[PDB]
Amino acid sequence: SMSVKKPKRDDSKDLALCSMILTEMETHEDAWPFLLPVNLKLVPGYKKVIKKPMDFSTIREKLSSGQYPNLETFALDVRLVFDNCETFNEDDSDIGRAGHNMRKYFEKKWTDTFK
């Protein structure tokens, strides 16, 4: 509350650390469905169904231009990429499996880097 604060957690490396995580997600062999925005002209149903499209290149540009206020808003966009994937792709598909694999990969790196 006013003039009553918990001890200050050091957030000065968060930007660099999120960038490193994002590099590792970018270079994973199962990243290919997530590298670029889904082409809304060429994928029937995507535009109407997926209310907030998100992809790694869009996260990279947001990160590089100071559009994440804190590390949690960064995680929310990464998770959005996988939630969108699950919404549109069957679990038993190459892309569906890719999304589950990348979500797992991400959540481990997230815990190990920050928790």
* CATH classification at residue 47: 1.20.920.10
34, with CB counted inside 10 A (0-12, 13-18, 19+), is buried
Rg (CA), the chain: 16
12, with CB counted inside 10 A (0-12, 13-18, 19+), is exposed
Residues 13, 101: contact at Cβ < 8 Å? no
Number of domains in the chain: 1
CA distance linking residue 3 with residue 77, whole number of Å: 32
Helix, strand or coil, per DSSP, at residue 43 = coil
Residues 54, 85: contact at Cβ < 8 Å? no
Q: Residue 44's domain spans which residues? A: 1-115
Contacts 24+ apart (CB under 8 A), 105-109: 105/24, 105/25, 105/28, 106/21, 106/25, 106/78, 106/79, 106/82, 109/21, 109/24
103, with CB counted inside 10 A (0-12, 13-18, 19+), is middle
45 dihedral zone (left: phi>0; alpha: psi -120 to 50; beta): left
